[PDB]
Nucleic acid binder design. Sequence first.
DNA 1: CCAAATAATAGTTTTTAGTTTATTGGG
DNA 2: GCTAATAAACTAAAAACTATTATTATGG
Lengths: 505, 459, 317, 23, 107, 122
Amino acid sequence: GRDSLIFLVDASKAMFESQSEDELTPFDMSIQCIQSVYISKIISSDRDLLAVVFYGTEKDKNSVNFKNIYVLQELDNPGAKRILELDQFKGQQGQKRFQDMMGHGSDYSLSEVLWVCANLFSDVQFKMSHKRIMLFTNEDNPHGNDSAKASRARTKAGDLRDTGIFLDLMHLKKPGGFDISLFYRDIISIAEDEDLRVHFEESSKLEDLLRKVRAKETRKRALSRLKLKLNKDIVISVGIYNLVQKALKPPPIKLYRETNEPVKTKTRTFNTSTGGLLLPSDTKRSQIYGSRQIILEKEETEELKRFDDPGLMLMGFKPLVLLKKHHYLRPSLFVYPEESLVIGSSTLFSALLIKCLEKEVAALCRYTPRRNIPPYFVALVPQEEELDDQKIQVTPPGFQLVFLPFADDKRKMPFTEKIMATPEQVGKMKAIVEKLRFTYRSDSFENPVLQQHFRNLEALALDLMEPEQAVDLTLPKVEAMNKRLGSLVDEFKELVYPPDYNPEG
Amino acid sequence: CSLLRLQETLSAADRCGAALAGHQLIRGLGQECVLSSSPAVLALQTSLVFSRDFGLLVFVRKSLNSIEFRECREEILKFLCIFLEKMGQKIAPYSVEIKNTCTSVYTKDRAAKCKIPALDLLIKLLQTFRSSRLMDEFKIGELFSKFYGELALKKKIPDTVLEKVYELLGLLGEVHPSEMINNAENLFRAFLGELKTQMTSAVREPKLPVLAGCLKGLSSLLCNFTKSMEEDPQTSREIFNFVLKAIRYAVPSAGLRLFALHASQFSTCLLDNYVSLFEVLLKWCAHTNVELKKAALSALESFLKQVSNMVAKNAEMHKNKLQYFMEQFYGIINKELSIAIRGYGLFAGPCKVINAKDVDFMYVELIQRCKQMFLTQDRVYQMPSFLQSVASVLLYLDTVPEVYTPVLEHLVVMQIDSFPQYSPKMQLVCCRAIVKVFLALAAKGPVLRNCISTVVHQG
Amino acid sequence: IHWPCRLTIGSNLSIRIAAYKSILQERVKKTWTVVDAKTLKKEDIQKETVYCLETEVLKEDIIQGFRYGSDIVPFSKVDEEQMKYKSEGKCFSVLGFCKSSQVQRRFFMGNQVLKVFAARDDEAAAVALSSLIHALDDLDMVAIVRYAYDKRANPQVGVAFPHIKHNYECLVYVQLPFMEDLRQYMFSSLKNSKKYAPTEAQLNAVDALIDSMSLAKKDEKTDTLEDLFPTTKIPNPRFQRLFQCLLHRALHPREPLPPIQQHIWNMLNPPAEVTTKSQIPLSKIKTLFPLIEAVTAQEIFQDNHEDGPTAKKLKTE
Amino acid sequence: CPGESLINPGFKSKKPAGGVDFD
Amino acid sequence: KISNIFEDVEFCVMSGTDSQPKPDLENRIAEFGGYIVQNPGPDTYCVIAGSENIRVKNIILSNKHDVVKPAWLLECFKTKSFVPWQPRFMIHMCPSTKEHFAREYDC
Amino acid sequence: SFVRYKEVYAAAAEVLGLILRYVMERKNILEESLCELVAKQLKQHQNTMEDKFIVCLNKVTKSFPPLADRFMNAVFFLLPKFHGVLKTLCLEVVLCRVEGMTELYFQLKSKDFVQVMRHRDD
DNA sequence: CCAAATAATAGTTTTTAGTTTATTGGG
DNA sequence: GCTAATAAACTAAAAACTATTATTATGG
């Protein structure tokens, strides 16, 4: 299902207070972090719910009527209006407006705020994959002092942990250290050791929290629950996935030129010869070759496209060397064992994966994704699991499905034949390549079009005078390449290109 | 009393967003539903005026696809359907305008919603039709045309659950006026295309569930005035109905119903393939879902009547009568027996055409049989079938054996005496049998008068 | 169609290049011309898109819009163009050199492969290209390159690796994915397979099958593997079946279309000798591995041929 | 948890968009 | 309505909240029958902007409308009538308003 | 855990709550091992699906009230998450807790007990 | 002839494969 | 004095993930 996260914000005095009273306050930096989180959720997955609440203030808004604890927004999809009203209290003067229309001066109750947020999570009508809470404060001793409320809040937090609430706290700016292990580190939802000292740090993860990452992050869904058939009856369930997937601009929305409300449309078929409405059964497809207009219906047209039922038809074993890497049809997919229909599928999958890794032969198979689709020829190469230093799966175990192009998957090609080059020029190119040797990383790039699109949409949402400008990761470092290389380009140009000739059309 | 204050609160409980408001709205709505559903005669009129005010409000005020109003409107429509049931035909004042509203509701207010509400609106409209006949039925052609344009939408976004539109497009509301009469041909084209898509397919697109039943319901609602027995489209639909029965959950029962309504409309093309129809209906009126049993029974009796008519008016009459009828009916030896007896009675027809002596022969042996079931002490569940069959053969008969007359009339009067201990359905069956034997007796004037006087006196 | 361009390495190195589509997901250039079902006149058939709420709306009363998460942003295509990031026409530059093993076929974006030469009959460009080819081949480096087709085509990130052939030398370009174009999905450790650890005899039978199901051959004892079932010089039979049906319908405007032909299966069927070899280990593994499984074949009414009444030569009463 | 995105629980940690830099 | 001269005049009020809240502008001008259109069409008499955003600047790019200050709108409100154009309120204006200024207003 | 349909866990949790109420017929308490077993089985795989959680919870609570105290927070949290008889089961379980009304009014009002209370289901 | 306890089908919002466009250079 | 085509976002369903629905077999 979805996920729930609530940002709980202190308001007593420290949020407005700053270490030097000239930089971001623990108040406004929380504003910025929440704005960034809103943007990231809008870009990635709005279906998750986000809530923001203030405690320690002089008023309250919770339905449960607990004083000093003011709720701002419910657990809900990130709305731009939430961001606007949030920025209304952003900056050292935004918190001035906060202190104008609101204030503080009354002690909060962690037990009460935990009660309130537990109710808020109870208000969710959707499957929450996780129940995360975001806390914005820098002190614990306000409740670490009175042991009554302290133990009360500890009990309540234990209850929340029983409920599966993933409580979290943020190292926040304080001129006296974050001050944990005093009233915290014994009450937080924690299962790993990160830091339990009195660290004078002001941030633990505000850095990447403010980091604006713009991507979709589709949840894991089985692209297909296929059934690999070996000969005719030895069939196993297999999960097919697209670990690589082209991202696309969100679909345009039809809406007024006058009020901009969404407009649904409707396309209908009319008898151009009559104006009368045309039935879906009232027309037939055709193709005209020569003097013959071959007329056909639709169902027959799809059936003549169907050759095999959906699934994988094992064509045999072919050595990995017999596969032309320069031959490529369309992006490859991943195949994992699936044991939900055919029991024992994963055991056989392990056996065949090990055997293929040993013998180093891929499984060529006839592929039918779904019905009314001509089967293709696909090579399943045994791709093994790989783990990082953290042992986190960087490569899954299973197979990689690569399309094998047919004869008719190429185009005619007029060209000139092979032309040699001197070994001196080859050595010069080796030196130049080694000069500009850079490490490849799959995530070193983004679509500048998409990035600028996100920035434009954001600026539209926030009604900015101007949008953010997208940095380009695809730019060649022409000045830097020339600086790194030197006159090697001139040397090789004189080596091959005669000084009279300039490469030009 | 409470209805007024609760409807006022609901009219006040929808003055904001806060989907919890819609939740309380549906709570109070279900409460008002369970209250008004309770019987009354004076609270009923309050229910009527509150129907006025509330239907107006929920028509205008919702104006949205927010589920905080969608759940409430869905329960509203369920309550209004159960209210249409018979909470007073005097609803007819409202009947028109609410009609308009719900139609508009189906389109405008429900513009992005594809859920139960459309189904509820459709069923309310259909109930309104089949309940209100020919008093305010003056607004259908516009709606017929609008839905005609709507169905030919190039999107399948009308789900199977929405194919109730066909049952809706099944229209005989007022006279079935001439405009949709003319459109009926294109209607047939659409039905043929849809049913061919349903029933002849290998494209993983059965969609039969509702589409099949709704198409059959529509065809029934329309073939009441069309489809004379000279069309290849007619026999094509006949073949479609055939394949419906067994291409290998009660859609086939709807098929049997549709056939039974228009068994005559498919005559002259159902003479062939007799044995498959006979056997399949026989097995069908044997299984669970007694709705299926009764549908098959009615279809079988209608089919038997039609085939009896044609074979009576045939010179090649031999085939059907000799191949199946007497053989199968004898091989029969619960309702199975009544079916066999009815088959005897209808088979009596062609016996007048050929072997007129066998008319009185089977009449006499039937007399012997019913006498043998007369003296044994259930035994009465089949008496009306005997009466029907003997009345049929007597109608065909012209020179009766008057010796069996006292016996038969005494049997009739004892059956009339045994009218109690009878389930109401077969009480109607037996009264039908009695009136039918009286109609048959009406052919023989003096014997008619004497026998009826004697039997009424004895009863 | 030829694509001229210049291989730009920095601001000082330019090589006139000849780009060509080598591999592609070919598709017929003739869509189904849907016509009338009555007079077969596609002209009489036409679509009618309409906008409304009724309350009808026109094409000239609507703009382009988008959904901003839980929000809706009206954003006309004019505004989209003005704030659009725009690339450079036909521009194609290199971004650097990286190890070949840094990239795998898993990152192969696009549905086409571009075999690229230097510009036709530019000897200096050709010699420079070949020198780059040899240098990269010996260094096992691949060139990360930025590509733009034209002014209105979005920029793409891909790599070019040299294809070595004695008759011609090309850089093979395949697009590479952004971090936006990736799925980070975890999968269970099949190596830590306690409940799916196959028996050794099963593994041996599997290996025996693969030996008996291997689709290659040792040629001339030169260890040059000989494939028995290429599928790369074999055309896609879908268009063959299409043409079969088209020809039948043209010759037989009323007959039902013929089924798939047996030679079509044969060109799809791997060598039957491999099948005969595999026959035995197939049954072996089938016995060895326990496998257990956890709507539209719409026929006519009659699973039989015919029925109906017929009582000729029978009037015995 | 190591190798998990803070913003999206259950999703792998999002590395910076980075770029090209020669070595 | 109250100042019906504002009717038949298509005002496109997307901007100006710092000067005066845009909802207040829309309410007041509808009380004069203004044709508040949420997107500038060809019939948009004047663009009403006091909170200049990317969208307002984009409108300025398309030299087809008058980017009117909301203060001009308050002027028309207190005059209870459409004031003629002034070369001190329309940040950007259509060439017709340019001619209007250049023919009756100094530079 | 065996849920092919209700009967299995329903009846078996019923008899478990019987036994818990009748720990050697309720005179010595040392079967808190079994109480923890059922507490886990509730928290395990039913703090996730939570459908049969309330079912067996109500069953055992009827057959043994003094156990839902481990789940008072849990039942309160899951209250505003159903709409049918499940809600009635939760209400019954709450009713079985008399030592549980130390403070509950805030839980009721927060969980809007007044609202479900307003709708008439006898 | 209503008499209750139990699985199926299909109400979501998801990807992906036939779609349609403005620049190509031929009397 | 020049229509050889391709870089096409469109209105595409041709997955349904998970949520009530309903006949059935009913039970005493």
